[PDB]
Amino acid sequence: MFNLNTIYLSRIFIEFNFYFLFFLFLISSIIFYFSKIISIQNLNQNSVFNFLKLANIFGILISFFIHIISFWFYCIYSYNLSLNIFSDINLYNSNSIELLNNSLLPNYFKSNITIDFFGLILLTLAYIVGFVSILALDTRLYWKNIKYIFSFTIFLLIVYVYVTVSNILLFFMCYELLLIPSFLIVYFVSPSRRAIQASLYFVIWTQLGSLLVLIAISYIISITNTYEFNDLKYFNFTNSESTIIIFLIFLGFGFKAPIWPFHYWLTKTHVEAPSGFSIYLSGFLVKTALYGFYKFNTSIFIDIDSSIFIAICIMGVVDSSLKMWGQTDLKKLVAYGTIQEMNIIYLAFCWGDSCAILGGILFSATHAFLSALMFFLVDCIYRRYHTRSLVEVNGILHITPNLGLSILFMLVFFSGIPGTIKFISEFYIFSGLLEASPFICFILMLVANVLGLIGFSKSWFNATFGMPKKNTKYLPMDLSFKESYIILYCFFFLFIFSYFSSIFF
């Protein structure tokens, strides 16, 4: 019963949501530039900053709704396309349906849009995490950094082109564009003075991996003059070229997606970055690397043993889990948790295009939401209690019961209770790893889910419980409606996404 109307509606929605975002950004930027001689806030109720905040927030939100609709259309379209290809067995019949483009808006960068489930999951993560982070950064943007209210819109446009393109070069360029806005945010919006050095560490560490990926892309392009991302089927790389490409790709994308030993920059940046931008970084900016690694390694044929890469990922997991205990800083502890989860996700991609990719994608989504939740809780603690250190913070539950309850439920979700996409992703990865290498699976599970979990829980429980006798004149009140509903939405997603259609998982 599938008809061409659904196909064209899917394509039109995907194409036009990008232009909706772009036109919103363009209008907002034109207003901002041409309303004032100097593009800084006027400290009065009639400033354009209020309009810009409104436009950014409710462009992201409306584009997120349209993205939900377009993602559902894509799911139907992909399912029915697979059915059309698979169903017919007659040799004379073949599915050759050709679509003509609309005459209203042009194709951005003269590229035909191609959408995949992983790309749309990444785009949904971008939308939601960007919404949370923009909601967080309101107190940070003041009177000279208001120009960074558009950072998340720029991120959304970059990610949209990144996930809706079938061109290798455009793919790589979109991946590399993410550096400038993130560096500028960390440099100009971070309150702490150590953020200045943290930004440089972030730039250099990420750029080393960017150069590695650039070398790999140069190898692919120079050898294969193609750029369509599908002509690689008709060209085979020799053993030496293939091993060089996989090594470069893995190391370069692991610089971004933190792997052992390349997580020093991540720890520094998470500790010294804005509490609202740490959410976006951990939640989304480390998963574009995973998506790019998946695309490249599934496109290239590799005839090498992945034991070395699996060992690197497992070593990162073990290192982060063991170090969890020794952190009294909640933000650094959450950063180590992010490193652990990202290393597990990266390990999920070490078997080419096997079924491990499904667990990897689900784990990427759950880690995004869980890291957003954890960093937002740390943000609330730091903002109301003027410290994010375990020695200075104690007995949160008895003065701010809602915040303590949020911490406890965050710990329960992090533990991986059944009924959560966290548990589902752990089940996928461990079920595969048990047959792949059962002893390695046992070691990984033991370390991560006992030693790292206990180290993680020690600090959070100590902060939540106790007796806050110190500085009774300065104790805060409670979570606000904004914070409470953000926490509730994170919990709601982590719980209900387990009912998403199992066809794609």
Binding site: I89, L91, Y92, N93, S94, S96
Partner: protein, 136 residues
Amino acid sequence: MFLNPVKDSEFDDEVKGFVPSEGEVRFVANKNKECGYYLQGIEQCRRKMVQLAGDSSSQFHSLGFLPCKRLVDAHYRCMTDDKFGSTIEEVPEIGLDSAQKFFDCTFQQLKPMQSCRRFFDQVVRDVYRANGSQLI
């Protein structure tokens, strides 16, 4: 495709699958990679001839698809390694039926090349199964 009908079947249509020999698979893959130019040429020339003389009143309407004959013969020779004749008309009786099916797919039904390559490859596979050691 790669399915054999059941000779003694209780119901009208029953099929049992078979897997071609590795030698046959290698031969077909190599020949397709080497001769893929001819198949794209057949598609482009088919469209070109239809555009040129598709109209009934056209002068060359009575010579339809004859220019494609050279491309088809070249593709057949390339796939069969110049053996078993220099023309599609010289196809052995073992592959004659599949050759007729391919011609019906391409020129009469004007079906997609995705469909008609199946019948052309079936012709090549029939020849290869018949001979075996002659092609390799």
